[PDB]
Design a protein around this ligand. Structure first.
Ligand SMILES: *[C@@H]1O[C@H](CO)[C@@H](O)[C@H](O)[C@H]1NC(C)=O
Lengths: 50, 56, 209, 51
């Protein structure tokens, strides 16, 4: 706010207000919100699966 | 051939050849014949049922 | 010998029909359900808990989102704020690990985590439009100099290597990508083993006499 | 077909099984604080149950 940090580097999603007050540079990295899940384990019933 | 993987078809072919060879060996060399027929029939039963179920 | 043969044949037909029907039902119910939940479409599911970091970027995005797929997710998260929402990213990862719970988080953090440990997966991805970059509160020219540095940095190959070595970490075991619907070796090999056992027992009892 | 039909449905109906199915009926008190929660707070499966 008081311009005591000339360069601002951090994980910062380019939001509407942030672009409104900071003319942000071109995006270093393109990304978005993703969903997370546990890997589905393979329920092996053994060799005698029939 | 999608329901059965190629290695399974390898195994099926080699099992058919092995059962044929062992039957020929037994004939060259009837309870044993009955047991061989029963186990081969069970193998065919399981393989055909699995193939039919997966393809269904 | 006619009656016994006929009844044995009828019994064989009934048994094979029942076995095939039951196996077909089992495989059909297995394949009908997707191995994962509906990718990025946890609506109409309401069984797997899902949420994001409390008052985070994902939480804020889902607050101001009117898409039919995401407004239902926001309503579910708000109705269960004390349960699905978590304070920190590590808390969310632990909650996902310990119980059936999906988490919504920035893509870079998800790939970083799923590369750190391979007991976790990233289902969809890039369902939101955002990016990371440096900034300057004033309309200075040196930020534009930084932008031209960005473009000249991507014009040659240096970003990918440093980005990957910062995310590679430890090795991850190989996993399938496009495996078909064929039976696995472990799925069927039992009949092969039992056939071999029966054959060797038959050979032994044949050579015994 | 018979086994697939009788196995496709979840043996124990849950907070999602009832919404997708129609054979089993469900209901509650007429606006007895139950469907008042159903009409608002639009959750996909809960919206289906409310409808
Ligand atoms: C393995 O998968 C089953 C099937 O959904 C489920 O119990 C859970 O996701 C896993 N169980 C573990 C890791 O004990």
């Amino acid at each position: 706010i008081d311009h005591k940090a000339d360069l601002a580097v951090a994980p910062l999603a380019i939001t509407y207000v942030r672009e409104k007050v900071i003319d942000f540079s071109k995006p270093f990295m393109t990304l978005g919100i993703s969903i997370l899940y546990r890997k589905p384990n393979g329920t092996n019933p053994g060799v005698f699966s029939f | 051939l999608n329901p059965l993987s190629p290695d399974i078809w390898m195994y099926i072919l080699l099992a058919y050849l092995g059962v044929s060879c062992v039957l020929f060996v037994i004939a060259r060399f009837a309870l044993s014949t009955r047991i061989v027929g029963g186990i081969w029939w069970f193998f065919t039963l399981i393989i055909i049922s699995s193939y039919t179920a997966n393809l269904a | 010998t006619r009656i016994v043969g006929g009844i044995w044949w009828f019994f064989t037909l009934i048994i094979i029909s029942s076995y095939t029907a039951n196996l077909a039902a089992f495989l059909t119910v297995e394949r009908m359900e997707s191995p994962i939940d509906s990718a990025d479409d946890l609506a109409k599911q309401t069984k797997i808990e899902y949420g994001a970091v409390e008052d985070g970027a994902t939480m804020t995005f889902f607050k101001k989102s009117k898409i039919s797929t995401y407004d239902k997710m926001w309503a579910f998260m708000s109705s269960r704020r004390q349960s699905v929402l978590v304070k920190s990213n590590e808390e969310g990862i632990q909650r996902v690990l310990t119980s059936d719970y999906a988490f919504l988080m920035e893509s870079t953090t998800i790939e970083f985590v799923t590369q750190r440990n391979c007991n976790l997966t990233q289902i969809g991805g890039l369902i939101d439009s955002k990016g990371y970059g440096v900034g300057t509160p004033m309309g200075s020219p040196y930020r534009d100099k930084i932008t031209i540095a960005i473009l000249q940095l991507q014009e040659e190959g240096k970003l990918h290597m440093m980005k990957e070595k910062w995310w590679r970490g430890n090795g991850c075991p190989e996993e399938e990508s496009k495996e078909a619907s064929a039976l696995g070796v472990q799925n069927i090999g039992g009949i092969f083993i039992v056939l071999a056992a029966g054959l060797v027992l038959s050979v032994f009892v044949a050579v015994g006499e």
